[PDB]
Amino acid sequence: XNXXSEXT
């Protein structure tokens, strides 16, 4: 959602 942008 975060952890990246797509990610967690």
Tokens of 6: 């797509």
Which technique? Answer: NMR
Cα gap 4→1, rounded to integer Å:
8
3 Cβ neighbours under 8 A, 6+ residues apart: none
Give the list of residues 6+ apart from residue 7 with CB closer than 8 angstroms, or none.
1
Those residues whose C-beta lies under 8 Å from the C-beta of residue 1, and which sit 6 or more positions away, are: 7, 8
Rg for the chain (alpha carbons), in Å? 4
Q: What is the DSSP secondary-structure string of 1-8?
A: --SSSS--
